[PDB]
Amino acid sequence: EFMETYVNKLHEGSTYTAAVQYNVLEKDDDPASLTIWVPMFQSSMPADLLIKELANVNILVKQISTPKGPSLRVMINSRSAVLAQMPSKFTICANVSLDERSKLAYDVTTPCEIKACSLTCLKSKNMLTTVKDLTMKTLNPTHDIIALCEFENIVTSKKVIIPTYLRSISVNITTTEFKNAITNAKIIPYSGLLLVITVTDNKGAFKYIKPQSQFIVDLGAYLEKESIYYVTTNWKHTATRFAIKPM
Amino acid sequence: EFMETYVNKLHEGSTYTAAVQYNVLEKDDDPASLTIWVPMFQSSMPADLLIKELANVNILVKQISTPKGPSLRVMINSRSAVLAQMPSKFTICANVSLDERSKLAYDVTTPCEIKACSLTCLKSKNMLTTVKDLTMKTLNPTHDIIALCEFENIVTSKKVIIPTYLRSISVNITTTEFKNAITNAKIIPYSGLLLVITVTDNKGAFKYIKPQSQFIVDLGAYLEKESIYYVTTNWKHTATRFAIKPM
Ligand SMILES: [K+]
Ligand SMILES: [K+]
């Protein structure tokens, strides 16, 4: 009922990985605005049905101290039977989650109102590779590979360029397949924003990655001083470039 | 010449660890505001002389992508002979460094103007213990120890309570010495803000810490959405409490 929603199908099949991201407002007189992404989970339900169920949950958060800094404990209730496998308790980085001018007190639970929901359907979880997955594998690297993600703010007409680290390698590495994969990479609303690179061939810069995988890259750390809702509704992804730089 | 400065002597001796934190403005028409803390270094120079030298350096920063997110490469030039041992190239977390509404473009060097400088004199570096130092030592913990740092914003009359993680322990632990050390702990402008707990006796909650040490705790991660200059000039540290919580 009048919920803003987005559904992005980046995988075709009866089963997919659901990457869900909520934009919420604190239920409060002076409300914090924040975005919450749910740990990825599998579904066999049609995405156009799943998004309707996702829109119906109830969310509470509590901000806490952790060894790494402020974190948000998230609780998701009022999950229908369809969402039995949806993670219901988890923790995310509070600085990334909360909008630029939004703050929460610590150690107090606060209910949130869902204002928008995005569902992106990815390949099966075993076919997803992360940056952290590859860092473990690198030995005696000489160079960094960086993705340059370019956006245009369509309302302010500002160009945004965010470099994000992909991996390091020892030093052709820039195969045609690699260049094409970077050029055609997609940005979706998850973990703030998530860069999704399709890896078919795994020669060169894609070494150690399973064939027919999605290499997914978190942009959330670069969005601590943004409103993620604002970004996902006003930034248009216009290009992806890359750089290979000596360490 | 008319530089705002602060000097805090938390150690008496001919030699000390210098903990230096600069508040700067980008040299620019639309300037970013940010705070830069220098890796700790030893000095035998009188603090009232060192602060004058510190005020005279030239600072440049460059914002870059790293595996952990946006970082600021800092370069400190125009160091006089007195500052020979002062770190001149290092990297800090850009989200913590930059003020709430301040942003930098990536991969471009930008000169900064120093607007204020704080020097805090700590014990010798081998007598400083960090949270990370203690996390390595913990095995099968059951509880977290949290420091509750309370401030008053003297201009807005807002109370600020920031819990910060000290350590975990296996489960008396709250000795009189521990309680007194927490009650009397100091907050200084370094790493955003730094909690400094003096450890004389190391029984209980202080186990594994060298006698006659300063246990120093970073608050910077909790200040990503603040202006550190604003905080160090407008927040008054009013109390420190603690909590011991089951994990
Ligand atoms: K944010
Ligand atoms: K900050």
UniProtKB/Swiss-Prot annotation, chains A, B:
It is a peripheral membrane protein. The lineage of its organism: Viruses, Riboviria, Orthornavirae, Negarnaviricota, Haploviricotina. Phosphorylation is important for oligomerization. Belongs to the pneumovirinae M protein family. It is found in: Virion; Host cytoplasm; Host nucleus; Host cell membrane. Keywords: Host cell membrane, Host cytoplasm, Host membrane, Host nucleus, Host-virus interaction, Membrane, Phosphoprotein, Viral matrix protein, Virion. Plays a crucial role in virus assembly into filaments and budding. Early in infection, localizes in the nucleus where it inhibits host cell transcription through direct binding to host chromatin. Later in infection, traffics to the cytoplasm through the action of host CRM1 to associate with inclusion bodies, the site of viral transcription and replication. During virus assembly and budding, acts as a bridge between the nucleocapsid and the lipid bilayer. Also plays a role in the inhibition of host interferon-beta response in a RACK1-dependent manner. This is Matrix protein. The keyword Manganese does not apply.
